[PDB]
């Protein structure tokens, strides 16, 4: 097809050539700019009814989203929908602006189809992002009604003395502009942050977040999800599941990047500090989805993320318990045509495996 034409040219020629000329962070910035301007190949893929999912109080035209980190500051939302994503997540956004870690802080591992990053929550801050989303608020209301929801991922400032207050501020400022919020407690690149996944600290934090969310007017009241690491102990996972059910958290995003370094990585930069993403994370993420689905009795929507680059990858996460999936790292290797690729392959596999649509496949492995 013309679809598989672009896919091949991008993956085999354009992307490796451009990536060889650019610093990884320059590549990131350039990608956000081009996306923001809508300077994109044609997304010829027409979303099928088979791909629609109803979860988190919304219709999703397709189950493939852009993960947090690509558009940290909400600059490229419309362009990301033009790429064919069924939903967009922006952030992480911190309350105050902050620079993040010194450069270089992003590393390519092409032999592993992986990235390592240590951005450290570089953010324009809540006020900037609020004004950016306000400028297109009604455009987004129509997008959401048309099955293209918006998520906002909230972080905390490096120097904050009260983490829960940083998240509360995010709920109050960006909650009214979001379909869902994410309490990101799983960056590997902010000191002490992942300790907020622990039981006592998590219950107190999430209680505060949910109280702030519940105080928003109805049409401005988002779902609240918790994004977790792939590096949790069994105890940590059980505790999260317990808290989520007790408080009525609306969903989970599973997973962030890993601080592990799986045996077999080949890239020269494998021992850089930071979170590892892409292919080496894939199965660690899938198995975290599987465990969290079981621990929550299939009653808590999961957005599955980590190492998705194909329809098989997406379907493995769906069958393990994800209602929706995200990707980021694949885009850095394949470019924009990867979105249509994943969707096309996923549709084909659903038909081959006897599923009437995505919904029927959610958690299917648990019923074998």
Ligand X SMILES: Cc1cc2nc3c(=O)[nH]c(=O)nc-3n(C[C@H](O)[C@H](O)[C@H](O)COP(=O)(O)O)c2cc1C
CB of 23 to ligand A1A4O, least distance (A): 8
* Region binding ligand LDA by CB under 6 A among candidate stretches 33-41, 76-84, 200-208, 348-356: 33-41
Distance CA 319, CA 327 (A): 17
Q: How far is CA 112 from CA 70, 138, 268, 326, 329, in A?
A: 20, 42, 10, 19, 11
> What is the rounded distance in angstroms from the CA atom of residue 324 to the CA atom of residue 314?
9
Q: Which is nearer to ligand LDA, 41 or 95 (CB)?
A: 41
Q: Which helix (H) or strand (E) holds 258?
A: none
Counting contacts by CB under 6 A, is residue 39 touching ligand LDA? yes
Name the helix (H) or strand (E) containing 167. Answer: helix 163-174
Of 55, 64, 67, 90, the one binding ligand X (CB under 6 A) is 67
Q: Which residue has the tokens 């400032």?
A: 157
Q: Where are the beta strands (DSSP E) in the chain?
A: 53-55, 58-60, 64-66, 87-93, 106-109, 114-117, 150-154, 180-184, 223-228, 251-254, 275-278, 302-305, 324-327
- Which is nearer to ligand ORO, 274 or 301 (by Cβ)? 274
Asked whether residue 79 is marked as a ligand-binding residue, the answer is no
Residue 310 interacts with ligand X (CB under 6 A)?
no
Q: Which residues contact 60 (CB under 8 A, 6 or more apart)?
A: 52, 53, 54, 86, 87, 147, 148, 149, 324
Q: Is position 275 an interface residue for ligand ORO (rule: CB under 6 A)?
A: yes
Q: Of these, 1, 30, 268, 348, which contacts ligand LDA (CB under 6 A)?
A: 30
Residue 293 assigned as binding residue: no
Stretch of 32-40, 99-107, 302-310, 347-355 lying at the interface with ligand LDA (CB under 6 A): 32-40
The interface with ligand X within residues 5-64 (CB under 6 A) comprises none
72 binds, among ligand X, ligand A1A4O, Cl ion, none (CB under 5 to 8 A by kind): ligand X
Contact pick of 35, 98, 160, 257 for ligand ORO (by CB under 6 A):
257
Q: Which is nearer to ligand ORO, 140 or 184 (CB)?
A: 184
Size (the chain), residues: 368
The least distance separating ligand LDA from the CB of residue 30, rounded to whole angstroms, comes to 5
242 as an active site residue: the answer is no
Q: Bridge partners of 252?
A: 226, 302
Asked whether residue 329 is marked as a ligand-binding residue, the answer is yes
Residue 157 touching ligand ORO (CB under 6 A): no
CB atoms within 10 A of CB 359: 16
Residue tagged active-site, from 187, 277, 285, 309? 187
Q: Which two tokens stand for residue 225?
A: 């999800």
CA pair distance 318, 289, nearest whole angstrom: 9
Three-class SS of residue 138? helix
Which residues are known catalytic residues? 187
Residue list, annotated binding site for FMN: 68-72, 92, 153, 184, 227, 255, 278, 307, 328-329
The binding site for ligand X (CB under 6 A) comprises: 67-69, 72, 91-92, 106, 115, 117, 119, 153, 184, 227, 256-257, 277-278, 281, 305-308, 327-330
The binding site for Cl ion (CB under 5 A) comprises: 176, 259, 273
Residue list, annotated binding site: 68-72, 92, 117-121, 153, 184-189, 227, 255-257, 278, 307, 328-329
């Amino acid at each position: 097809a013309m679809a598989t034409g672009d896919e091949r040219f991008y993956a085999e020629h354009l992307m490796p050539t451009l990536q060889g000329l650019l610093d990884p962070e320059s590549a990131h910035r350039l990608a956000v700019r081009f996306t923001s301007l809508g300077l994109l190949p044609r997304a010829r893929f027409q979303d099928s009814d088979m791909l629609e999912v109803r979860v988190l109080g919304h219709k999703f035209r397709n189950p493939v989203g852009i993960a947090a980190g690509f558009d940290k500051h909400g600059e490229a939302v419309d362009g990301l929908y033009k790429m064919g994503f069924g939903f967009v997540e922006i952030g992480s956004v911190t309350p105050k602006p902050q620079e993040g870690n010194p450069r270089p802080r992003v590393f390519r591992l092409p032999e592993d189809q992986a990235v390592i990053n240590r951005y450290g929550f570089n953010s324009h801050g809540l006020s900037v992002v609020e004004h950016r989303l306000r400028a297109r608020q009604q455009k987004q209301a129509k997008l959401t009604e048309d099955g293209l929801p918006l998520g906002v991922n909230l972080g905390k400032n490096k120097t904050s003395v009260d983490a829960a207050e940083d998240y509360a501020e995010g709920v109050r400022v960006l909650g009214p502009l979001a379909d869902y919020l994410v309490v990101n407690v799983s960056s590997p690149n902010t000191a002490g942050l992942r300790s907020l996944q622990g039981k006592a600290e998590l219950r107190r934090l999430l209680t505060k977040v949910l109280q702030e969310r519940d105080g928003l007017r109805r049409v401005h009241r988002p779902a609240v999800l918790v994004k977790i690491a792939p590096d949790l102990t069994s105890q940590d996972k059980e505790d999260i599941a317990s808290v989520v059910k007790e408080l009525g958290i609306d969903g989970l995003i599973v997973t962030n990047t890993t601080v592990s370094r799986p045996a077999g990585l080949q890239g020269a930069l494998r021992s850089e500090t930071g979170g590892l993403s892409g292919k080496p994370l894939r199965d660690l993420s899938t198995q975290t989805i599987r465990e969290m689905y079981a621990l929550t009795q299939g009653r808590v929507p999961i957005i599955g993320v980590g190492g998705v680059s194909s329809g098989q990858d997406a379907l493995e996460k769906i069958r393990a318990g994800a209602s929706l999936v995200q990707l980021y790292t694949a885009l850095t290797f394949w470019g924009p045509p990867v979105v249509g690729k994943v969707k096309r392959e996923l549709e084909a596999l659903l038909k081959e495996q006897g599923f009437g649509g995505v919904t029927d496949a959610i958690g299917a492995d648990h019923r074998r």
